[PDB]
Design a protein around this ligand. Structure first.
Ligand SMILES: [Cl-]
Ligand SMILES: [Cl-]
Lengths: 10, 286
């Protein structure tokens, strides 16, 4: 999945 | 004579490094690194070892748990969680280690599971009312508090706080914070629950507010010296230490502690070797 954290994917 | 250790983190990617700070001598040294790259994990001190729960290895969200022996200086791996958890909160309550919230990372999590040193096993308990990623947790008077975080469902950073009673096995909302704090640094000092820093989107705060369980009210204290999110938090000897984190752009190598008596935040005379974010911290004896 995306490397970024969930809040930063936003 | 205690020592403070910092486990894993980002700098800027997942690392294995683990630094140690000697208070008596004021110095940072490297100790036994992690068996694997780990960041965004939950780090707690459960007598008398340090635990690294879940997290991110730079590529995958993990369910594994690693344990550190401060005498032999080595990491061993206990039972893995039922679910993969990253950016989760972890704490110890009634001889149980709770893993709270996190990221899947397909979806934010509201589930909570606990670990027993007796059976070496993880089991689910009552889930939270709101799913929380980038969440911080604290234990005050036999109660478990989940502070702020991020809700992927409503797509917003949270100001709500939930309380868990192990006796009744259910979560209830308490007093909301003065503002929305995701990835806040959460710790407990003198029976008071602290919510330090945090962020709402691109805005990183240096303000700190503290919760009183008796009165169910939040009150504001002194701002930190710097805006921090995703920092490591632990308390020792009446002082609440905040370690690393980032200002939304750069990971920090500075550490500052809070003195509730004087209402002051004081920087450590010696920064970390490498600036870290999403790194866990704990305090043991040398
Ligand atoms: Cl994550
Ligand atoms: Cl960053």
């Amino acid at each position: 999945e995306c490397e970024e954290t969930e809040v930063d994917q936003h | 004579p205690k020592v403070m250790i910092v486990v894993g983190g980002q700098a800027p990617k997942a690392i294995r490094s683990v630094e140690c700070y000697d208070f008596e001598e004021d110095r940072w040294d490297q100790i036994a690194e992690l068996p694997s790259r780990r960041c965004r994990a939950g780090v707690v001190f459960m007598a008398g070892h340090v635990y690294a729960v879940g997290g991110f290895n730079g590529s995958l969200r993990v369910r594994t748990v690693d344990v550190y022996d401060g005498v032999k200086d080595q990491w061993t791996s206990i039972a893995s969680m039922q679910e993969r958890r990253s950016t989760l909160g972890a704490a110890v309550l009634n001889d149980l280690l709770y893993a709270v919230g996190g990221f899947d990372g397909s979806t934010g999590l509201a589930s909570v599971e606990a670990y027993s040193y007796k059976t070496n096993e993880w089991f689910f308990v009552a889930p939270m009312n709101t799913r929380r990623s980038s969440v911080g947790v604290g234990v005050v008077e036999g109660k478990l508090y989940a502070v702020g975080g991020y809700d992927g469902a409503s797509r917003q950073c949270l100001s709500t706080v939930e309380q868990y009673n192990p006796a009744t096995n259910e979560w209830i909302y308490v007093a909301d914070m003065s503002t929305r704090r995701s990835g806040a640094g959460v710790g407990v000092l003198s029976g008071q629950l602290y919510a330090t820093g945090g962020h709402d989107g691109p805005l990183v705060r240096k303000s700190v507010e503290v919760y009183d369980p008796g009165t169910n009210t939040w009150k504001q204290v002194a701002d930190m010296n710097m805006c921090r999110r995703n920092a490591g938090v632990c308390a020792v000897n009446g002082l609440l230490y905040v370690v690393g984190g980032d200002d939304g752009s750069c990971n920090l190598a500075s550490v500052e502690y809070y003195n509730p008596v004087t209402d002051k935040w004081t920087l450590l005379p010696t920064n970390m070797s490498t600036g870290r974010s999403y790194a866990g911290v704990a305090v043991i004896h040398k």
